[PDB]
Design a protein around this ligand. Structure first.
Ligand code: B4P
Ligand code: ATP
Length: 134
């Protein structure tokens, strides 16, 4: 069993949340592997920009999710740390690794999300952002 560790962001702009559509056609949150020499917060900010071209600023830590996945028979146990972010600059645009990047009203975002962890993280992010007048 292999272990992986990523960090991502749940970024809001004027009430809407930033999402990306994966190659599998699933809408999820922008994230990436925590590279050697990076703290998870650094990874999250960098990955949001590389994947969506949007610059965000971390307001606080939201939570962590876990999931198992297989690839060509290998099994990997993956952990993703998510951070709440406020929109700073830029216009959503997909990286070469994603199909699309776009802002969605909270309501539509709820219907688009699929992964158990994403739904759980989103709910936590929503409660948490009210505190930051976001
Ligand atoms: N992704 C992968 N690719 C290829 N081969 C793999 C692999 N994962 C495992 N393997 C292979 O599978 C084997 C089994 O390894 P595991 O099963 O990974 O390890 P352990 O033996 O459980 O002790 P360990 O090192 O896990 O614990 P620690 O809490 O320190 O470590 C906690 C984990 O957290 C990560 N981590 C800890 N601190 C971190 C930090 N500060 N920032 C980012 N990541 C951090 C570490 O990378 C560490 O694995 C390894 O022998 C390896 O050969
Ligand atoms: N939150 C989640 N819960 C469950 N499964 C997930 C989740 N996210 C992704 N997956 C599934 O796990 C597998 C790997 O996706 P993941 O996104 O982790 O891959 P990746 O592209 O290598 O990673 P990173 O984006 O960290 O660069 C896929 O089969 C995917 O459908």
């Amino acid at each position: 069993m292999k272990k992986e560790f990523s960090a991502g962001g749940v970024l809001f702009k004027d009430g809407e949340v930033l999402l990306i559509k994966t190659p599998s056609n699933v809408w999820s949150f922008p994230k990436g592997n925590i590279e050697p020499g990076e703290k998870p917060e650094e990874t999250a900010v960098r990955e949001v920009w590389e994947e969506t071209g949007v610059k965000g600023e971390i307001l606080d830590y939201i939570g962590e999710i876990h999931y198992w996945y297989t690839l060509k028979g290998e099994r990997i146990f993956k952990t993703v740390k998510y951070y709440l972010m406020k929109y700073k600059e830029g216009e959503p645009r997909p990286s070469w690794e994603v199909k699309d990047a776009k802002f969605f009203p909270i309501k539509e975002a709820k219907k688009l999300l699929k992964y158990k962890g994403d739904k759980e993280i989103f709910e936590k992010a929503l409660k948490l952002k009210e505190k930051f007048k976001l």
